[PDB]
């Protein structure tokens, strides 16, 4: 079945976990502690020396976005056709770009850069509000009328930003409604409220 090997944080695995949970999929968590990681053997076996590591049967994958795309492809969360598939990728790449900035802030200069980051936030969130407005008036999902892996990644990105800058979504009616709507999905709602999710720190350095 599925196995995700990762540190005891939400980080880059939050989206894929929400996806699995929401799609009613079963998976095993292999927690890697800072001690275990610093030992060296695991890191050494990792293709790019980083986690998450994911296993689907005997298929072993690295890179969170590769895992998301793999699940999107195998579970049918990759658009209804090629055109939509391209759009889903475009959304995900945008999410990834902002995620990199967020990660950089959190681990590079949280104290000093937090203000400038929050100031620039609206500009970074606008593209997604726009994408939503062009898709059935932002009533369904980010691309098309069926959920995609990009939706889970974007949802995660929005939720963690809500924590970073409370109220940042107030200026974006579509994104706000979107978050509320996706957060209300039965299986996803249950998962987001569970200890498994709630009791894990967002990041590894305690900053959020």
Nearer to ligand GSH, 92 or 176 (CB): 92
Nearer to a second copy, 132 or 192 (CB): 132
- Confirm or reject binding of residue 69 to ligand GSH (CB under 6 A): no
Backbone angles phi, psi at 5, to 5 degrees: -105, 120
Question: Is 51 known as a binding-site position?
Answer: yes
Helices (H) and strands (E) counted in the chain, each on its own, are: 10, 4
177, containing H or E segment = helix 173-183
Minimum CB–partner distance for residue 89 and a second copy (Å) = 4
Which x/- pattern over 152-191 shows residues binding ligand GSH (rule: CB under 6 A)? ----------------------------------------
180, containing H or E segment = helix 173-183
Give the separation between CA 173 and CA 128, rounded to whole angstroms.
11
Q: Which does 131 bind (CB under 5 to 8 A by kind): ligand GSH, a second copy, none?
A: a second copy
Q: First-to-last CA distance in the chain?
A: 32
Question: Is 37 known as a binding-site position?
Answer: yes
Which x/- pattern over 93-122 shows residues binding ligand GSH (rule: CB under 6 A)? x---x-------------------------
Closest CA to 14 of 116, 102, 133, 80: 102
Would you tell me which residues interact with ligand GSH (CB under 6 A)? 11-12, 43, 49-52, 63-65, 93, 97
């Amino acid at each position: 079945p599925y196995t995700v090997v990762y540190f005891p944080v939400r980080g880059r695995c939050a989206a894929l976990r929400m996806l699995l949970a929401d799609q009613g999929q079963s998976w095993k968590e292999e927690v890697v502690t800072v001690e275990t990681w610093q030992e060296g053997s695991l890191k050494a076996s990792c293709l790019y020396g980083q986690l998450p590591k994911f296993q689907d049967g005997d298929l072993t994958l690295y890179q969170s976005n590769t895992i998301l795309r793999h699940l999107g492809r195998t579970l049918g969360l990759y658009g209804k056709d090629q055109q939509e598939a391209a759009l889903v990728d475009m959304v995900n790449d945008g999410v990834e770009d902002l995620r990199c900035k967020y990660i950089s802030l959190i681990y590079t200069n949280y104290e000093a850069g937090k203000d400038d980051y929050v100031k620039a936030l609206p500009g970074q969130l606008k593209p997604f509000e726009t994408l939503l407005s062009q898709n059935q008036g932002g009533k369904t999902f980010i691309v098309g009328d069926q959920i995609s892996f990009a939706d889970y990644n974007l949802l995660d990105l929005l939720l963690i930003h809500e924590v970073l800058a409370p109220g940042c979504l107030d200026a974006f009616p579509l994104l706000s409604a979107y978050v509320g709507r996706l957060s209300a999905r039965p299986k996803l709602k249950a998962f987001l409220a569970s200890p498994e999710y709630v009791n894990l720190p967002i990041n590894g350095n305690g900053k959020q």
